[PDB]
Amino acid sequence: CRDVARGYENVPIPCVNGVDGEPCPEDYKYISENCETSTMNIDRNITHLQHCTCVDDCSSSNCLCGQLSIRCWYDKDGRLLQEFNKIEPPLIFECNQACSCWRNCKNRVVQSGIKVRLQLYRTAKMGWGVRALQTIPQGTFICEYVGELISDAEADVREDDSYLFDLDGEVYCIDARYYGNISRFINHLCDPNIIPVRVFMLHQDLRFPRIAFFSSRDIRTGEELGFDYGDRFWDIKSKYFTCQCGSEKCKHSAEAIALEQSK
Ligand X SMILES: C[S@@+](CC[C@H](N)C(=O)[O-])C[C@H]1O[C@@H](n2cnc3c(N)ncnc32)[C@H](O)[C@@H]1O
Ligand Y SMILES: COc1cc2nc(N3CCOCC3)nc(NC3CCN(C)CC3)c2cc1OC
Question: Stretches 42-50, 67-75, 130-138, 207-215: which one binds its own copies (CB under 8 A)?
Answer: 42-50
Say if residues 210 and 242 touch (Cβ distance below 8 Å).
no
Q: How far is the CB of 197 from ligand X (least distance, A)?
A: 19
* Closer residue to ligand Y in complex, CB, 8/28: 28
Residues 6+ apart with CB under 8 A from 66: 52, 58, 72, 107
Answer for which of 2, 16, 19, 127 binds ligand X (CB under 6 A) is 127
Residue type at position 141 = F
R_g of the chain computed on alpha carbons: 19
For the chain, the farthest-separated pair of C-alpha atoms sits apart, in whole angstroms, at: 62
Q: Is 52 annotated as a binding residue?
A: yes
Nearest by Cα to 180 from 142, 149, 130, 146: 146
Please tell me whether residue 98 binds its own copies under the rule CB under 8 A. Answer: yes
Q: Which one of 6-14, 62-70, 111-119, 136-144 is the stretch in contact with Zn ion (CB under 5 A)?
A: 62-70
- The one of ligand X, its own copies, Zn ion, none whose footprint includes residue 103, by CB under 5 to 8 A per kind, is its own copies
243 binding Zn ion? (CB under 5 A): yes
User: Quick one: what does residue 244 bind among its own copies, Zn ion, ligand X, none, with the CB cut-off 5 to 8 Å set by partner type?
Assistant: ligand X
Burial letters 139-178, b for 16+ CB under 10 A, else e: bbbbbbbbbbbbeeeebeeeeeeebbbebeeeebbbbbbb
> CB 151 → ligand X: shortest distance, Å?
20
Residue 38 touches its own copies, criterion: CB under 8 A: yes
What region does 156 belong to: left with phi over 0, alpha with psi -120 to 50, or beta? alpha
Residue closer to ligand X (CB basis): 91 or 236? 236
Smaller CB distance to its own copies: residue 10 or 135? 10
C-alpha separations of 144 from 131, 180, 207 in Å:
15, 10, 17
The β-bridge relationship of strands 92-93 and 194-200 is parallel
**Is 15 annotated as a binding-site member?**
no
Q: Which of 126, 133, 202, 256 binds ligand X (CB under 6 A)?
A: 126
Binding-site member from 30, 121, 163, 172 for ligand X (CB under 6 A): 163
Which listed residue (34, 187, 193, 204) binds ligand X by CB under 6 A?
187
State the Cα–Cα distance between residues 245 and 36, nearest whole angstrom: 33
Is 185 a binding residue for ligand X by CB under 6 A? The answer is yes
Specify the residue, 166 or 205, whose C-beta has the smaller distance to ligand Y: 166
Q: Using CB under 5 A as the criterion, which residues of the chain lie in contact with Zn ion when the complex forms?
A: 52, 54, 58, 63, 65, 95, 99, 101, 105, 107, 190, 243, 245, 250, 252
